[PDB]
Symmetry: C2
Subunit: 261 residues, 2 copies
């Protein structure tokens, strides 16, 4: 409903089913969600991993050109500006098909790209055959009165990746994902710990349905710093809208830890 | 009951209330538990943090001598040998009161000390006033057909510490603890993730009652690699006896992670 008293940030997560290799369809779905989110007074929309082309790594590598990626990117920056909402998307990277990774980018409500990130932790042999892993830590930036960061999918399952964001000041970590196979331990067990162990909030936006030979779990969720869900979806398409309201990060002996991994 | 078909390791956890500064009492409680565990066919007993002197950091520093610590240590090695059970205990370290830490040690059923470890992550200002932090990673060793490791209390709440054990081959991480204040997120949220994110089993043995001005939570638990409790206690004294039956550790990009903490 109405924006509450103690909240100045309202976010939205898109959970839907993409059509493999049909960016016009999938980007129309993101535009629809962006509009709906903005109508409900959200200031940012998070969407799932590789949504624009579908989660089809091998087919992205074989069939999607750099010019097609750029065309999608341009449309998404357009959606952010035209729907007046910050937008996090995930696309192949901008290089050629043999040299690019899986990315996440944040555009503000004016359409400016504020931050870009390449997935460090690729999942499985298909991703590793289709994409180059990222080599840079997660970005952290001020937006909306807080420090936001980006990670993609499998990345959040490594405590190191979330710690790398929180070490740089992250408060709100936004994670496009694509999680299939009834993997309940990721949102059920790992995400709450990532939140608690860093004192942060995490938003996790999944696909949810038949798509590319998989059946995605849905279960999109926003987890706060106590490890509790602030909002969660089930298995069907939906738009989750959430108002956001030990000192592990100081106590950790990082100079020793770094030598022990 | 009877040792089951698919299990060759049965462990026990002691959960009890210690009396501050009364090692004879507290070590008699460990001897009792060791006997009971051995009668029930356990091969190893895990006991809680600082149990022999009570969880009273400031008073340990002010009043407990190195010779008193050594006397306790000697009795514990005696209990392991005389009750014919491997034993994990936690005592002040062996140096003088201004130079020692909080330790965990594993003795085998012959009373041989197989491994010793000094707590790296001290909790709060009282611990930090009474003890020196450890500087060495967790030990890992073969016992009973598996690779065992040690950590103490607060250590397990850092993913880095559990990763350091699993990186060295740990399969079973044994954690004396002292957790008070109805801190449900530690066993409820963090321990299951430590298990899942490494593929390991963890045993967590707490105090449980009035002791040293705190009321300890109990909730001793053994968590398996799916994050599920294999056995758990409530808030009262007890002896938990448990039969033990993505490739994160390979996939992690440790050479990058180490630069990002």
């Amino acid at each position: 409903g109405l924006v509450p008293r103690g909240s100045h940030m309202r976010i939205a997560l898109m959970q839907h089913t993409a059509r493999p290799l049909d960016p016009q369809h999938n980007l129309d779905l993101i535009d629809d969600a962006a509009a709906r989110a903005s109508e409900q007074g959200a200031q940012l929309l998070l969407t799932p991993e590789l949504f624009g082309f579908g989660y089809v790594p091998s087919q992205i590598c074989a069939q999607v050109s750099a010019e097609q990626v750029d065309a999608a990117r341009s449309r998404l920056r357009g959606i952010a500006r035209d729907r007046g909402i910050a937008l996090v998307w995930s696309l192949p990277g901008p290089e050629g098909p043999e040299q690019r990774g899986i990315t996440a980018e944040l555009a503000d409500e004016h359409g400016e790209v504020l931050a870009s990130y390449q997935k460090v932790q690729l999942y499985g042999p298909e991703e590793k055959a289709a994409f180059v892993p990222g080599e840079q830590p997660p970005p952290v930036l001020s937006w909306g009165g807080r420090q936001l960061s980006l990670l993609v999918a499998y990345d959040v399952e490594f405590p190191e990746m979330v710690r790398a964001a929180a070490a740089r000041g992250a408060q709100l970590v936004l994670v496009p994902t694509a999680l299939a196979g009834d993997e309940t331990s990721v949102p059920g067990i790992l995400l709450p710990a990532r939140a608690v162990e860093n004192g942060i909030t995490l938003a996790y936006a999944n696909h949810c349905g038949p798509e590319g030979g998989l059946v995605f779990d849905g279960g999109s969720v926003v987890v706060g710093p106590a490890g509790q869900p602030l909002g969660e979806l089930g298995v069907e398409p939906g738009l989750l809208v959430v108002d956001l309201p030990a000192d592990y990060l100081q106590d950790r002996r990082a100079e020793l830890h770094r030598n022990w991994l």
